[PDB]
């Protein structure tokens, strides 16, 4: 434990862990209680009324602070029970943050960061800073001064205001010059924020409403990261503020966000800053550390302490990771400085802690907190010691229900925030309305982003989850500076807090006159007061806004006509079922017009709901969006401008041979780096000025749907109240089920709207942002190619030649693919981007797919598709084609007479999947035979197979043959290239090269520039031709042709795209079928049974052996061990196909009799030895397994463990335990294509 010996509150005043304390302050302060909790950390159970003199009262100020939410209380912390609970909670939060390894490293970093003793006016002396120590007064009467790092004090006047403060100096800015000082954290554990999250429905479609409470551990972690930045003296200047534009009506009035907050939030927010400012900060901090190292080198004396100067120098060199070269000459190395800076900046982030804790948190700081919740942490029945609010084994663990207020309501109590709902407001008029400040768009200014693109560059000879665990492994421990004796300072420690820059109060009540309706008017037109009078829906905002009793709706006229009708007792159940069904009908509508680029699901009713673009018609909105792209959604167009990129200058070493090649190599490398940097800048600009508006629109849609549901159930309850006693008792009704079903409809509509906004943002990025960069960037490539050309000839030859020009023409004529995988994390965004490119590029030349009981081309170009009589199709999946070595085992494809050119194929590609059986007959050696033909009259291409190799042949009219080959050996213990499903693709640039790719990996390139004219085949042939084997047969599926050359990116994702679990061969795993077993970690062994029963067990033995035939193949035996069978437990699918997340039972065949697999989870140890039992077993033992990995679950739903093996003594037994491997397995169905003989 990090916190031993819990200190209660009424323990005595011994003096080393509990004592009375003098804090530094400007004036006089009385003795104050606190409890030492660890080395160099203290916790003070009192309100912060001593550090700042201006805050002498706890009354809410007349001028409320510009904060989204805030609560005030003056009797809190007053009594001793509150002090005890406060201290218990803060201790629990410290131990919880210490529990996680990342938090453990952060706590160690906090401990080690003792401030520098640079307070001596004389340069060569070390003196402690007077303002970074605490005077501990002993019961005897005297006091001792002691240094420390952190102080935890109850909140300020504003209770929920958690912050970090430091004690400054007259001339030294400690927090930003590498010295650092003690930090005071104004914090409380008893209160939490309450925010709203609407991006969880992807994981939990059954989620109800939001209103989630942030884990107080995360807030304490944020405070600790602020502290950690301040101890190492690397805090960013507070006056550096991410300024925003505030002139417009739709622009948020104003809010300060310093760059230190952006750094500490991390993750998505950390991308709001460009690389240039980060580089400036890094250089400045490196210079400051060089300065402190120089000062430490200069100093040779110390006054005011007992221990040696050498000991303190050792402590400081460990704190700053400095290096001394055995000569008393300290120096910092760029590598260790970079590592430490990355650890303090990029590793220690709020996002990483949220990911590790598995708790809800707002992904962006824009999602302002909306409530204050009183909580209780001291009891363990409310907040578990390990997993936070999400207690395991309970209903709260699932779906992250612990943080949901509406479920875990007995834990959270809502409080009335003292910031008015409309205290900070703006006025909009056309009929005037008021808007809260925190519900407006966030418009960053252009000044916050800068570029060094214009600056020219010269090149010389030499120019240039897991990572957390590697850093933890590399991290150092056991070195915590011991407590030190110092000469005591005065009775009173004078000192002033670090001065905060002044922020002027932003104006309130501004009036804006507009000639059009803004979306705020529409959003207000749907609210109501839920008075006694009847409320009526309407389709005109002009009346809904004016009349308080009339509420606007964007639904169809029949809906409002129905909801305005009075009905009788017998009719109400039909009325409510009709209205809920109809409501689902409008909420589920999606447009079918998909000719627009990757906006596949256009949702119309967003138009009249929020008045996007100033239309009130669904069809008009659809037309406007189709015409104008995603621009119309944005409230204001974000200006993007890429100035001319600087040129590149190369130095010349007269008569050089190998340094010049280095110069060209470095030129290429810097070209790649420039491309990467400009993509990064474009992405950060997009994320800063595009995503926020989309997020706000999504939030407005969510609240609009909720308001519509509110009005509907309000009018329904109004109608319900009209009845007399007999009707209401005879005819029952409740609102809970209606609320649940309406919320579920809201969620299913919200999934569609969220996805729609996702493609909107991605399409806008791909369409109206990247071309501006790419044009200037390819102009830069043109200039660079010109420079490299001038150097490659230079009208001289004293150089080092066709290879260099080939390389420069190759790389500087093509484009590097653009992906956000290397720029963004938001998983939702990631999927949309890639899925889009591949899905759209699917449409191509031939899309031969077998659906609707026929083999057809979905690319509507193929003329006719001939099917031979001797072809075969797989009953389990009709899309597989099996071809035999017979004449009628043929498939002819009549290629479109349109796309047939003599000199076509300039840039094009093919891709498909092949399964090849295992070669048996020795005559097949060197027996080349064509499998796919598009060659006529000695010109075309052909795919052919031979003994363990695939051959792609291109052939022109003038005899110039070009053969590219991919080979594999048959004499290997484990093969990925025999009887397995293999993705094969061929890319062709008739200008430069032909490339081959297998399952998405690079194999071979050959030049095809010497190729001339390659006339196009009339048709496509699918037939074995020239294969001497009388039994040879193939398997092929998903054949596709691409009219343009492909690239590594579009080919790799394609593999996964075309990729329901699969077997060893890649075919669909099937139920009620036997299967052998194979673990990837240990391939050379097989599974075996022993004395089956509760005492019985499965184990790993071998070797599996070997089956071979001379000079044809050698391979280890595969049909070894007892076969495994899988059958349905609760899957409702009629077919025997298994899919992901299917809970099924597992049985094994032993001497031709079936056994359940099950184990007793109550056995000691995390490892759970499985056993083979008879079918009449006992249901208590866990036997349900979910689905290439498999996980055993308890009968109550608890996961027993991932099925794997453990080396139990000398026996490799099988376990279900909660290793980088051992969770990988493989099923081997009996295959006729392999041919090994069982027995």
């Amino acid at each position: 434990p990090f916190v031993n010996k819990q200190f209660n509150y009424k323990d005595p005043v011994n003096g080393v862990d509990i004592a009375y304390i003098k804090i530094p302050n400007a004036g006089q302060m009385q003795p104050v209680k606190a409890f030492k909790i660890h080395n160099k950390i203290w916790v003070i159970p009192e309100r912060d009324t001593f550090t700042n003199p201006e805050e002498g009262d706890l009354n809410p100020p007349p001028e409320a602070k510009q904060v989204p939410v805030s609560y005030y209380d003056s009797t809190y912390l007053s009594t001793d029970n509150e002090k005890d609970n406060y201290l218990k909670g803060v201790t629990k939060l410290f131990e919880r943050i210490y529990s996680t390894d990342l938090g453990r490293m952060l706590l160690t970093s906090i401990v080690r960061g003792i401030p520098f003793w640079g307070g001596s006016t004389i340069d060569t002396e070390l003196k402690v800073i007077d303002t970074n120590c605490i005077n501990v007064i002993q019961p005897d009467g005297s006091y001792r001064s002691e240094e420390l790092n952190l102080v935890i004090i109850g909140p300020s006047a504003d209770i929920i205001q958690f912050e970090c403060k430091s004690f400054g100096h007259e001339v030294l800015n400690l927090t930003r010059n590498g010295y650092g000082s003690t930090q005071y954290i104004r914090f409380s554990p008893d209160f939490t924020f309450g925010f709203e999250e609407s991006l969880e429905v992807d994981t939990n479609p059954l989620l109800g409403a939001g209103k989630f409470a942030t884990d107080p551990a995360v807030t304490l972690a944020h405070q600790l990261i602020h502290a950690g930045h301040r101890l190492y003296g690397i805090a960013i200047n507070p006056n550096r503020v991410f300024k925003v534009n505030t002139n417009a009506y739709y622009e948020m009035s104003g809010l300060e966000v310093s760059f230190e907050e952006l750094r500490t939030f991390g993750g998505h927010d950390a991308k709001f800053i460009d690389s240039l400012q980060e580089n400036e900060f890094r250089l400045y901090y490196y210079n400051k550390f060089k300065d402190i190292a120089s000062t430490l080198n200069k100093a040779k004396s110390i006054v005011g302490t007992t221990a040696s100067l050498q000991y303190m120098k050792n402590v400081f060199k460990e704190k700053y990771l400095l290096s001394e070269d055995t000569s008393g000459k300290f120096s910092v190395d760029k590598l260790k400085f970079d590592k430490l800076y990355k650890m303090l900046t990029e590793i220690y982030t709020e996002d990483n802690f949220v990911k590790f804790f598995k708790v809800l948190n707002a992904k962006t700081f824009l999602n302002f907190d909306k409530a204050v919740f009183k909580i209780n942490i001291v009891p363990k029945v409310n907040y578990t010691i390990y997993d936070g609010f999400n207690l395991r084994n309970t209903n709260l663990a699932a779906n992250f229900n612990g943080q949901n207020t509406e479920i875990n309501n007995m834990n959270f109590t809502k409080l009335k925030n003292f910031t008015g709902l409309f205290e900070f407001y703006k006025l909009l008029c056309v009929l005037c309305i008021k808007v809260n400040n925190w519900d407006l768009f966030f418009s960053p200014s252009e000044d916050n982003f800068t570029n060094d693109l214009n600056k020219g560059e010269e090149i010389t000879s030499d120019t240039n989850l897991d990572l957390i665990q590697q850093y933890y492994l590399t991290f150092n421990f056991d070195n915590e500076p011991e407590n030190i004796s110092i000469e005591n300072l005065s009775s009173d420690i004078i000192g002033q807090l670090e001065l905060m820059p002044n922020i002027e109060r932003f104006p309130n009540g501004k009036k804006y006159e507009l000639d059009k309706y803004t979306m705020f008017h529409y959003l207000r037109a749907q609210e109501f007061e839920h008075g006694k009078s009847r409320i009526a829906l309407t389709n005109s905002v002009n009346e809904a806004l004016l009349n308080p009793s009339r509420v606007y709706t964007f639904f169809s006229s029949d809906y409002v006509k129905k909801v305005n009708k009075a009905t009788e007792a017998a009719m109400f159940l039909g009325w409510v079922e009709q209205l809920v069904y109809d409501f689902t009908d409008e909420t589920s509508e999606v447009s079918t017009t998909d000719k627009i680029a990757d906006i596949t699901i256009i949702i119309p009713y967003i138009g009249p709901a929020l008045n996007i673009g100033n239309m009130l018609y669904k069809d008009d909105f659809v037309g406007a969006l189709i015409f104008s792209g995603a621009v119309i959604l944005l409230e204001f167009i974000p200006e993007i401008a890429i100035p001319v990129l600087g040129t590149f200058a190369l130095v010349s070493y007269i008569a050089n041979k190998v340094l010049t090649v280095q110069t060209i190599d470095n030129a290429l490398s810097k070209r790649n780096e420039k491309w990467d940097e400009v993509y990064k800048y474009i992405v950060t600009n997009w994320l800063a000025k595009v995503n926020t508006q989309i997020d706000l629109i999504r939030k407005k849609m969510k609240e609009a749907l909720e308001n519509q549901a509110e009005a509907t159930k309000a009018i329904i309850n109004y109608q319900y109240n009209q009845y007399t006693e007999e009707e209401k008792n005879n005819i029952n009704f409740n609102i809970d089920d209606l609320s649940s079903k309406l919320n579920e409809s809201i969620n299913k509509a919200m999934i569609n709207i969220n996805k729609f906004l996702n493609q909107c943002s991605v399409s806008y990025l791909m369409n109206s942002m990247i071309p501006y960069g790419v044009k200037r960037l390819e102009d830069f490539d043109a200039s660079l190619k010109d420079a490299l050309l001038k150097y490659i000839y230079d009208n001289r030859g004293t150089l080092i030649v066709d290879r260099l020009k080939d390389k420069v023409n190759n790389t500087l004529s093509t484009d590097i693919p653009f992906q956000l995988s290397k720029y963004v994390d938001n998983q939702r965004l990631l999927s949309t981007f890639t899925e889009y490119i591949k899905n759209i590029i699917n449409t191509s030349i031939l899309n031969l797919r077998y659906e609707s009981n026929h083999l057809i081309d979905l690319s509507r170009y193929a003329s006719k598709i001939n099917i031979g009589s001797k072809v075969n199709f797989d009953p389990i999946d009709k899309n597989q084609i099996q071809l035999f070595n017979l004449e009628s085992s043929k498939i002819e494809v009549i290629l479109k007479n349109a796309i047939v050119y003599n000199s076509m194929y300039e840039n094009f590609s093919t891709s498909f999947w092949i399964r090849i059986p295992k070669y048996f007959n020795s005559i097949s050696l060197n027996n080349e035979y064509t499998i796919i033909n598009c060659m006529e009259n000695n010109s075309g291409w052909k795919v052919s197979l031979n003994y363990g190799e695939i051959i792609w042949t291109l052939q022109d009219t003038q005899e110039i043959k070009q053969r590219v080959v991919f080979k594999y050996s048959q004499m290997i213990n484990i093969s990925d290239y025999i009887n397995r499903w293999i993705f094969v693709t061929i890319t062709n640039n008739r200008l430069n090269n032909s490339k081959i790719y297998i399952n998405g990996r690079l194999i071979d390139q050959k030049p095809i520039s010497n190729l001339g004219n390659i006339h196009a085949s009339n048709n496509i042939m699918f037939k074995l031709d020239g294969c001497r084997d009388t039994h040879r047969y193939i398997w092929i599926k998903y054949f596709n042709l691409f009219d343009k050359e492909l690239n590594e990116k579009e080919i790799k994702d394609l593999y996964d795209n075309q990729s329901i679990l699969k077997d060893f061969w890649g075919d669909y795993l099937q139920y009620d079928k036997p299967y052998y077993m194979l673990n990837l970690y240990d391939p050379n062994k097989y599974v075996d049974v022993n004395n089956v029963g509760i005492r019985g067990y499965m184990y790993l033995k071998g070797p599996r052996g070997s089956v071979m035939t001379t000079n044809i193949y050698l391979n280890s035996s595969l049909y070894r061990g007892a076969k495994f069978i899988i059958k349905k437990y609760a899957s409702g699918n009629k077919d025997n196909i298994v899919r992901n997340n299917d809970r099924v039972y597992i049985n094994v065949v032993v001497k031709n009799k079936e056994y359940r697999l099950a184990t007793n989870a109550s056995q000691a140890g995390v490892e759970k030895i499985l056993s083979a039992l008879e079918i009449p077993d006992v249901g208590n033992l866990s036997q349900v397994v979910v689905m290439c990995k498999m996980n055993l679950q308890d009968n109550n739903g608890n996961d027993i463990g991932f099925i794997g093996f453990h080396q139990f003594n000398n026996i490799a037994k099988l376990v279900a335990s909660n290793r980088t491997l051992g969770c990988s397995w493989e099923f081997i169905p009996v295959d006729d294509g392999w041919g090994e003989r069982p027995l």
Partner: protein, 527 residues
Amino acid sequence: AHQYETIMDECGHGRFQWILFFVLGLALMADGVEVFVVSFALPSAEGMLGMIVYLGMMAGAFILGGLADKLGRKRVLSMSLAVNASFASLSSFVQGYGAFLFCRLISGIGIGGALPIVFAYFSEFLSREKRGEHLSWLGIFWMTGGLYASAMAWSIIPHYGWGFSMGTNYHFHSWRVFVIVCALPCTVSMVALKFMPESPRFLLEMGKHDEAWMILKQVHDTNMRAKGIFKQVWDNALYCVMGPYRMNTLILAVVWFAMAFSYYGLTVWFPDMIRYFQDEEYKSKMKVFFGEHVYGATINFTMENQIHQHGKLVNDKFTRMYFKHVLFEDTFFDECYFEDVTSTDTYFKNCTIESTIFYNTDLYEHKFINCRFINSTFLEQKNDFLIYLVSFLGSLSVLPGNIISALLMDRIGRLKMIGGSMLISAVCCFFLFFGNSESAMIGWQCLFCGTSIAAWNALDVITVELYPTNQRATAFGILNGLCKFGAILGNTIFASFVGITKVVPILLAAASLVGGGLIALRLPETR
């Protein structure tokens, strides 16, 4: 020297010299059992890898052999036999062949310096006139050693291969107890040597003549009651060769090399020849099989000493059986099944093996020569008593030949005896050629041995009588080292020359003996 000789003559022969003779015959027994355990135990434990210990003996015979003349005879013998016994006992508790061989090598280092010291020791105690007899008697103990070392060996470890096997259990430790018990004579000698006194003549040579008088008085009283620095040692060794003692030492070295060549070659050649004769007789037997068609047959028994040619073994099954000296050529298997089959010296050649399963077998790859597999698979895969007897008999054969040398060397001489014996043995060797049988071999072996012991005894006496007490030990030591050299040579050549020719080794042997028996005559007379 005259007064010492006179007082030793007056002391006479009695209880004390007999007790000393026994406690020294113990060490000679230790030497004999070392020769046995190096020449017939290690070479059957693995080949002649262990022989290197012989080389170690060489160093001992020069390190602990020449040192004693400068330091002492009781102390050097005590240290030598103590280190031999201790390191043999350590070799008993050893896992692995390398450590055991190293321990045997250092034990050989310790014991190789025992024979010169024991002979020099006993030569300074017995009466001058009755010197040839008693010394000769000591020789028999040496031979007895081998006999004992042989007689027990076949009782304890009649199973070769115990050396190159450490993967076995803690049982099969018959070699461990054998190594323990082969250190019994040296242990009893170490117990006994605490009572025996130092050498009187050597002690007088160094000084402290009062101690010499005390030991002489003790010997006289016992007999009456019964009857009622390495620089110096190297210069000493050189003083034995390239000085006044020049021709005598050369002739003695030649004779010792010749005898230790022929004898230590033939003693190991004879068991090897008898084993080769048995092997030749055995090979004469075989069933030839041509054109077989074995259909649906399950084999359970053991078939041995057969060859199959052009066989067609279709749908056969070999389960839990033994293959012994059976050969397959041009045989066409078909879906045969091999289960728990254990093979020895069987070899498949040019066979077409199709659709078979080799499960739980030791028919490894090396047992297949130029064979073509088809659709096949390979699943999980798994007393030389006579020699000792022969040895015993040989060692035993010299016993009668020794007594007839013991009470005769004071009549014929010390030069005629060796000459004749050597020549006589060479004649017997020339009759070997004629013999070709088990009985014949052992008869010849015995004969040779019986006539090859008088020489050794004569040799021992002539080599211990010539040098004075100040070069004796050193000299004896080097001649023993040279004897160990000849041993290695003969035990290498004769051994390697088996099954290739018989006349060559025999002729070679005869020649050596003749040569030595002709040079032995050119030696200073000692009577």
